[PDB]
Amino acid sequence: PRVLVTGALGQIGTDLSLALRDKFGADSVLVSDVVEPGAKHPLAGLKGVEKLDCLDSNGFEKLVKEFKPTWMYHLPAIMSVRGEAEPDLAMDINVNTTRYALELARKYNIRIFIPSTIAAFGDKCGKTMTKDDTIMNPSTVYGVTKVYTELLGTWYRQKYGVDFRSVRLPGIISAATLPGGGATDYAIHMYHSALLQKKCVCPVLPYESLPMMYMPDTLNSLVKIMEAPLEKLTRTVYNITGFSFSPSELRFSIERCTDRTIEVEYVEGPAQKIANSWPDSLDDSNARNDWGHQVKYDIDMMSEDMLRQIPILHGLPSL
Amino acid sequence: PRVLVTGALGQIGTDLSLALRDKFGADSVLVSDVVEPGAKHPLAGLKGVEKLDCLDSNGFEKLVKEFKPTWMYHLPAIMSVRGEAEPDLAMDINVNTTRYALELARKYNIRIFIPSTIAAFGDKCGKTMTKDDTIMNPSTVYGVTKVYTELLGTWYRQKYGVDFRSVRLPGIISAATLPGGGATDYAIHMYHSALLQKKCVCPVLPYESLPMMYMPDTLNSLVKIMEAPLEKLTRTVYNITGFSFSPSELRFSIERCTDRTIEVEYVEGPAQKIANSWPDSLDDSNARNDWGHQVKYDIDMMSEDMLRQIPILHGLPSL
């Protein structure tokens, strides 16, 4: 497998890029992003990490044509909250980069991964154990563009035989890289605002349950879905989930793990109406069945690791 | 009541633009298109006809700014058959023109109608009396872009308060336009063939039912929906239908009228797989109930009208 990741320097890409370099050999992985990594970023100083604007279609084709990837994880998008404030940029990046990637996959025979999201859903979806197949009525421009992503990929599969694969990722939690302007960002800032002990102001309301998942489970599935023989895939897009929580539940979990009575001031934010139009939980039976999606981490295990890891990697108070 | 039409010179835009000039006075109406009207084009010569490529937002804005519409019907799109063969074009037009249209509706406070289509539905929609809210899995790039069109316009309404209105149009019959190799244009080829007493070569399978509507009812409806008080509109996107027929029912209808046999040879054309994935009929009761959508022509009525009108408009043989 010769693998290319676009949008690599972000939350997902960072841990993805490292896990692919580790699993497959730093030689077999090329990675790229619009910016250059800064001084402290985990992929800084590493070979095979290019600067590439996915909107520059010639640059995109030239990187691909030279590297001859066989897999591609196409990760750039503008996410929910920031898309509502910069919608022109979200229409650009999430439609046009997506289109250039599908065309390069076709032209150059690439198995292509594009994440969708629970943001593709909206208030008519069936919010409890949402099925893979249901009414799609997202209420953010982000989700809108990702419904397009899902349908456009599936059409490329049908029309040209392009091996397009996707999963509707839920809230993904990690320590390495701080998230990129979505609603689930609160969780990770709570973990920090527990460490520094400063008042966590949480934009999301306390009992708003969302599907969520910890990064190593997320990394395991990203690869596993892409390892799978095409014949085992009954569809192109799949719900996967780790487990659901509310911000009062994260608060509690971190409150156990630390032995502290930490402060959260629930000052509602733009994220709130966004989250509320999302499902409380997904049915991911079809992924479990088709290609063996599996979770190990529960919410308490996640906190253990998280409070243990931010200090190492970022240098906040330890123990 | 002031009115911009874009893509005003095609099938719908010709009989919409003439209906609107009549009803609301020619000084209220501006029609535009990327192409000039042909000398034999109904709109030839006439005051109030403009040439605009909607891919150029600056010109669209200019025209919009000069004229100052209260209303806009935005009609340009590459439909289903041509889209599969020219997807680059379908994606540019169906997505980008739509984008610039909604933005100008936002910026200059215009009531904006953009039609969707039954082609936004796929094989999972519920093919009998299809509902307004259902699973939307389009088998065409056209269909894919129209779903995006539905969701991006619904989001414009919630985010900025744009008055976005839309209906899913069934197959649309009119004498005023020629038999192009489109998806539902077998119906219109079978009339010209019938008066010419040639054979009809029908690419669509003999008992493929489809939602259809005779233009009269479409122009009535396209206006009824744009005249409605906002508070009556329970939704942004409505199914409307006239009536469903198959090619064999349309055959029995023509022949009842001619009192001759006319012979049709059924083959496979590209239209067949596309039309097979579309529904057999639509539930349009939301459109009846909120804004009084109504249908006057049945299939015999329509055939009688078309038999008359075509020789008149295109030189063909008659009775």
Ligand SMILES: NC(=O)c1ccc[n+]([C@@H]2O[C@H](COP(=O)([O-])OP(=O)(O)OC[C@H]3O[C@@H](n4cnc5c(N)ncnc54)[C@H](O)[C@@H]3O)[C@@H](O)[C@H]2O)c1
């Ligand atoms: N992390 C989550 O909770 C989550 C959930 C669901 C889906 N996703 C999906 O995962 C993908 C990435 O998520 P993330 O959280 O890692 O994003 P991020 O915002 O952390 O990273 C996005 C990266 O894209 C890069 N980028 C932006 N525009 C670019 C361009 N034009 N060319 C090249 N690179 C560009 C930025 O440099 C950034 O590194 C997105 O498609 C997102 O919808 C993430």
Ligand SMILES: NC(=O)c1ccc[n+]([C@@H]2O[C@H](COP(=O)([O-])OP(=O)(O)OC[C@H]3O[C@@H](n4cnc5c(N)ncnc54)[C@H](O)[C@@H]3O)[C@@H](O)[C@H]2O)c1
């Ligand atoms: N005809 C049908 O039965 C039917 C059914 C369902 C939905 N619709 C929708 O109704 C709308 C109009 O359909 P139609 O039947 O008149 O199609 P049409 O092709 O007959 O007319 C389309 C017009 O768009 C113009 N155009 C193309 N590119 C343009 C651009 N860049 N800028 C400005 N104008 C451009 C074309 O010159 C043409 O005059 C389309 O959205 C179509 O998807 C039509």
